[PDB]
């Protein structure tokens, strides 16, 4: 009838695994009901229309002269901005334009209470936010993309390569980095990578597009593990599979090949494709968009992994997080396609520095800070729910008792 010191440990395991399963189910429960809305949110926002702002000042202005003030949901807003003020637009392919606009709009709409910009002395003071191969020493103050014409064939500097980066920090994420590069021969790339902070146990997000004369030659998207076992959490795998069923249906499964450098980082559900026609490209685009949005909405509810003194389990977990992040970091710079693209034009002495400080830098002792601006949520709130100052109440009771005379 009584129990033994071994089944009570069985009981604690029962309870804790049940709780883990419960939270993992709660994560996916929201996506499960309608997955098509992970891509179709913009069209719905457009359908519902403009909203009429009703603050006391807005109503007063509207009743004095004539003016109606309108607002829009953040999805419609990030579709009017587009590839807004990138300096290298107008030479970027329309597919890369679509993808960059969507990704950065997601970052701006979902993480808008902690999204800082990465510390400027790391990347933006050296001048790595806009890089030209005809002006590596930056003596044209960063207008080389306009002052210098394109070299002709066989001339010194052919083929010309130019890069544009953007880097952000946040609460959960220690680096959200997007980068677009163009070469003169007709090659365009796009490289996105989202890194969580060392104290969190989440997988890294990554996306690459590489297209040649308007034809996508390589498109890879991966929510890549961080553990030594290379298996994600139940919600990550469940979401990737549900999304592949929703968007990649009717598509060649034998196309998601594993490259020689892939299985060392690839989650079993990672995608690597060389699209054939418009259908493959449209399906892949919708799928990558929905996957990125899901990854962010899942991070929205994350809790740090804290190692209390006396608990070694969490210390080992944090060590594992460090190993996985660094493994991915030095395993990505051996994607020597883009690295040789860079080193054939910019040299090697500049490339080592730029790559080791920005591209896939790893510094467990260094994660930047962030700026918590959630109090603004209060101000905006109290602009649609104002309270007036103890004298308007007498007057309003007067008005109510007066009009109700009828």
């Amino acid at each position: 009838s009584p129990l033994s010191p071994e089944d009570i440990m069985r009981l604690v395991q029962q309870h804790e695994d049940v709780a883990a399963a419960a939270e993992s189910e709660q994560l996916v429960a929201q996506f499960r009901d309608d997955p098509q809305g992970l891509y179709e949110y913009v069209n719905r926002a457009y359908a519902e229309g403009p909203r009429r702002v009703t603050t006391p000042i807005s109503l007063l202005q509207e009743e004095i002269t004539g003016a109606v003030t309108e607002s829009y949901p953040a999805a419609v807003a990030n579709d009017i901005i587009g590839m807004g003020s990138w300096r290298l637009k107008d030479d970027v392919d329309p597919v890369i334009e679509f993808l960059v606009a969507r990704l950065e709009g997601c970052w701006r709409e979902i993480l808008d209470t902690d999204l800082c910009l990465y510390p400027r002395e790391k990347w933006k003071e050296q001048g790595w936010d806009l890089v030209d191969s005809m002006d590596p020493h930056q003596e044209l103050e960063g207008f080389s993309y306009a002052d210098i014409p394109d070299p002709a064939k066989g001339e010194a500097g052919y083929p010309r390569l130019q890069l544009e980066n953007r880097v952000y920090c946040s609460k959960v994420f220690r680096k959200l980095h997007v980068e677009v590069g163009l070469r003169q021969d007709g090659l365009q790339v796009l490289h996105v990578v989202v890194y969580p902070r060392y104290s969190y146990d989440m997988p890294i997000f990554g996306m690459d597009i590489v297209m040649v004369d308007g034809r996508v030659t390589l498109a890879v998207v991966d929510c890549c593990p961080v553990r030594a076992d290379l298996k994600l959490q139940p919600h990550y795998m469940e979401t990737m599979a549900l999304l592949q069923r929703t968007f990649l249906e009717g598509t060649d499964p034998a196309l998601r090949r594993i490259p020689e450098w892939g299985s060392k980082i690839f989650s079993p559900l990672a995608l690597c494709i060389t699209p054939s026609g418009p259908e493959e490209l449209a399906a892949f685009a919708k799928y990558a968009v929905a996957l990125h949005r899901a990854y962010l909405t899942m991070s929205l509810n994350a809790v740090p992994v804290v190692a209390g003194p006396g608990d070694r389990r969490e210390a080992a977990r944090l060590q594992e997080i460090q190993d996985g992040q660094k493994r991915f970091c030095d395993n990505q710079l051996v994607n020597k396609k883009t690295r040789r693209v860079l080193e054939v034009a910019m040299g090697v002495e500049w490339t080592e520095a730029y790559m080791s400080q920005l591209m896939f830098d790893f510094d467990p002792k260094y994660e930047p800070p962030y700026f918590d601006a959630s109090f603004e949520k209060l101000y905006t709130y109290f602009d649609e729910n104002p309270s007036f100052g103890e004298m308007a109440d007498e007057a309003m009771e007067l008005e109510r008792g007066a009009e109700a005379e009828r």
Partner: peptide
């Protein structure tokens, strides 16, 4: 009045 963009719905 034209799009000139690219969307996966043609």
């Amino acid at each position: 009045t034209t799009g000139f963009g690219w969307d996966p719905d043609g």
